[PDB]
């Protein structure tokens, strides 16, 4: 279904442009760090619980992330309907535990897990899981 | 002021991620080459009529462009309402002249302007002018 060349771009990077839908219908853009599960074909990112115009994400979870290739203009865009965990509220709740696994997948073992836990709570962190439904873009070539 | 920091990010780059809105309301992402006019605070890009982004802009002109700072992580996002010229129809029309102006600003003096003129018509090129109405993001020093 998906172009392996585009999936390779996603696999060879760890940051991209996340796009969600604001109340007025306009996309909200940001540079985020992500984890890509190549078998389950899903992308995971950590965000603070949205507020104001960005909160619309809660009622319309359609999202996309653009990832840059290593050549001149190539890029891949993963599209899907995001699933969100409730915001982190306790240093040991299910959400934080899930965010610890995400951190491990993206950066590895943290130096002060206790600091991390409180940071997640202070930022009302949400783990956004985006199962990939559509992949498009411009595939890089032999180089 | 703070906006000056976001505008400096935009002024210091020539590529960004354009987000248009699909027929169904979902964001559509792609990258684009651009020229920033500090004089009128405009972002100018060359797009082809048949492309998805152009068709999206013809129905809903709202657009956003995210640009990375020189650190590749900090960024700025320009939000505004796109103004599109009709597609180049004749080698000497105003749309072509506007595209010649853009080419000079982005790449410099073309070797064969007559060839460029023909090319713009063949590709149904359009000049996208995005006056920056609002800017947001996390400029250097905030990440």
UniProtKB/Swiss-Prot annotation, chains A, B:
Its EC number is 1.-.-.-. One of its GO terms (molecular function) is protein homodimerization activity. Coiled coil: none annotated. InterPro entries: F420-binding_dom_put, F420H2_bilvrd_red/Heme_oxyg, Pyridox_Oxase_N, Split_barrel_FMN-bd. GO terms for biological process: vitamin B6 metabolic process. It is an enzyme of class 1 (oxidoreductase). Belongs to the F420H(2)-dependent biliverdin reductase family. F420H(2)-dependent reductase able to catalyze the reduction of biliverdin-IXalpha to bilirubin-IXalpha in vitro. However, kinetic parameters show that it is less efficient than the biliverdin reductase Rv2074 and suggest biliverdin-IXalpha is unlikely to be the native substrate of Rv1155, which probably catalyzes the reduction of an alternative molecule in vivo. Binds coenzyme F420, but does not bind FMN or other flavins. Cannot use pyridoxine 5'-phosphate, pyridoxamine 5'-phosphate, pyridoxal 5'-phosphate (PLP), the anti-tuberculosis drug PA-824 or aflatoxin analogs as substrates. This is F420H(2)-dependent reductase Rv1155.
């Amino acid at each position: 279904v998906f172009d392996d060349k585009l999936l390779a771009v996603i696999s060879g990077n760890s940051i991209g442009v996340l796009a969600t839908i604001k109340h007025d219908g306009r996309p909200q853009l940001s540079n985020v760090q992500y984890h890509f599960d190549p078998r389950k074909l899903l992308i995971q990112v950590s965000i603070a619980e949205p507020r104001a115009k960005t909160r619309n994400l809660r009622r319309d979870p359609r999202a996309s992330i653009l990832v840059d290739a290593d050549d001149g203009w190539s890029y891949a865009v993963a599209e899907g309907t995001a699933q969100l965990t409730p915001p982190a509220a306790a240093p040991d709740d299910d959400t934080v535990e899930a965010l610890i696994a995400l951190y491990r997948n993206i950066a590895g073992e943290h130096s002060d897990w206790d600091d991390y836990r409180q940071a997640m709570v202070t930022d009302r962190r949400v783990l956004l899981t985006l199962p990939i439904s559509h992949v498009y873009g411009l595939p890089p070539g032999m180089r």
